Amino acid sequence: STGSATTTPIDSLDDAYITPVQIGTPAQTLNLDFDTGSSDLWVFSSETTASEVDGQTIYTPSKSTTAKLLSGATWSISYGDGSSSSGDVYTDTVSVGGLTVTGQAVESAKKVSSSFTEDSTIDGLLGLAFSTLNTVSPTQQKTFFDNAKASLDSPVFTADLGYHAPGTYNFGFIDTTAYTGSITYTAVSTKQGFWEWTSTGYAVGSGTFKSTSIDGIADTGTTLLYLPATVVSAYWAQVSGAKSSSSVGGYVFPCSATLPSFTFGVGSARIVIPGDYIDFGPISTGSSSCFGGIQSSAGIGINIFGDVALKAAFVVFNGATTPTLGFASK
Numbered sequence: 481s482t483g484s485a486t487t488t489p490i491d492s493l494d495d496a497y498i499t500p501v502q503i504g505t506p507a508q509t510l511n512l513d514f515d516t517g518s519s520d521l522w523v524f525s526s527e528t529t530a531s532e533v534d535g536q537t538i539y540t541p542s543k544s545t546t547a548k549l550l551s552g553a554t555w556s557i558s559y560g561d562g563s564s565s566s567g568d569v570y571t572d573t574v575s576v577g578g579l580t581v582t583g584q585a586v587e588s589a590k591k592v593s594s595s596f597t598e599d600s601t602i603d604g605l606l607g608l609a610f611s612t613l614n615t616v617s618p619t620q621q622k623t624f625f626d627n628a629k630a631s632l633d634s635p636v637f638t639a640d641l642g643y644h645a646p647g648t649y650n651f652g653f654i655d656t657t658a659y660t661g662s663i664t665y666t667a668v669s670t671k672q673g674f675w676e677w678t679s680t681g682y683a684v685g686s687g688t689f690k691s692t693s694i695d696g697i698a699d700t701g702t703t704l705l706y707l708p709a710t711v712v713s714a715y716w717a718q719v720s721g722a723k724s725s726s727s728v729g730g731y732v733f734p735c736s737a738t739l740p741s742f743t744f745g746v747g748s749a750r751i752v753i754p755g756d757y758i759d760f761g762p763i764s765t766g767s768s769s770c771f772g773g774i775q776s777s778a779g780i781g782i783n784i785f786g787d788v789a790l791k792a793a794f795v796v797f798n799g800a801t802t803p804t805l806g807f808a809s810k
Contacts, residue, residue: 481631482652483579487514487641490601493760494787495703497641498601499649502575503586504544510537510603514649515701516639516675516797517784519613519623520557521574522565522587523604524596532592535600541588547572555587555615560702560780565592569616574624576606579651581628585614585621605701608637608797613673625651625799635799639700640810641791643757659794659808664749668803672782674699675797677805679785680747682707684715685740689750696783698790698797698805704760705742705753706777706784715742715774722772728763731772735762742774744789746807753792 487497498511503523510523524533526540541547547570556566567590574584589604596602607614611622629635632652640658641647648658669676674697681691694707712731716722718740722733733739739755758773773788796806 481579481628482633482650483575483577483628484648484650485577486646487649488646489642489644490599492644494641494644494791496602497647497700497787498603499576499606501606503539504541504572505546506544507575508537508539508544510539511601512604512606513602513701514606514608514639515699516608517697517699517701518557518559518605519607519609519611519673520555520587520615521585521604521606521624522555522557522567522589524592525567525588527567528589529591532597534597537603539586539588539604541570541572541586544572546582547586550585550616550619553585553616553619553621555617557615560784561595563593563595565589565596567591569621576624576651577649579628579632581624584624584627585616587616608700609675610670610673612670625797628652629799637797637799639790639795639797641700641787643754643791647791654796659810661809663794663796663806663808664746665796665798665804665806666746668805670803674782675803675805680745682711682745683743683750684718687718689743689745691745694744694783696777696785698785698795700787700790702784702786703788704784704786705758705774705788706780706786707774708783709776709778712774712776715740716772724776725769728769728771730775732763732769733772735768735770737770744785749807751789751793751807751809753789757788757792
């Protein structure tokens with residue numbers, strides 16, 4: 481089997497991407513944030529505290545003839561941005577782009593933090609990291625990809641995120657029309673539960689490539705590119721007036737600037753992020769200070785190849801017995 485679904489930016493900045501997912505019988509369609517940095521499929525639901533729902537579409541398990549309470553199971557998750565959610569668990573039928581998994585754990589939110597409530601466009605998350613990170617207790621549950629893998633034509637999914645435009649998540653096949661050149665594959669460590677890999681270096685603009693190992697994660701659920709302070713300083717030093725602002729929480733730059741590109745290495749190959757992809761617009765409405773898309777990871781503990789980086793590539797998440805990642809230009 482295969483599946484193919486369009487993913488759409490939630491706003492004009494590409495802060496996140498939503499993908500329609502069918503849950504239950506008859507289908508209830510929710511728009512979920514596909515997140516290769518976590519491993520829980522959770523949804524706003526009829527159980528979510530009413531004051532914490534503000535415009536999201538909810539899953540109502542009592543209206544699904546295939547829903548079953550997973551008795552005793554609870555979940556609770558905290559994300560790198562400080563947001564969180566928690567609740568109980570049903571199993572139900574879940575379909576993405578024509579690919580159907582029966583018995584998928586659908587984690588129903590009883591509580592969500594304010595940033596989820598405040599984002600009316602995201603009805604939940606669909607985790608695509610390794611199932612060892614799934615938070616369900618006392619019986620850990622598998623991701624949608626893990627459950628579908630055996631049925632897929634090939635044990636892979638691909639992320640093709642657009643810049644200010646829709647893109648595609650495919651399951652079970654590699655669309656050879658969706659990228660240019662060849663796909664360069666690189667080793668993955670699953671030891672922390674992430675799609676963790678080592679970039680071979682970077683360049684700023686038309687500058688020379690610096691060969692240096694950068695360990696980080698491919699994370700579709702993180703908006704920006706988080707890299708070591710040395711790398712980030714070298715980038716923003718090429719932008720007149722750019723500075724790190726403690727009050728704003730990162731590097732800002734004059735909105736009048738033209739940003740240089742940023743290149744990252746994948747083995748001997750190179751992925752070029754255009755300068756425009758690094759512009760996240762005014763820090764507040766009407767400001768001439770703009771927020772940068774490349775930020776320091778120094779306070780995180782891990783480097784994060786988020787959407788800013790991934791949207792410049794066609795990315796293969798290869799879930800073979802030894803997982804690997806592939807990157808192609810597009």
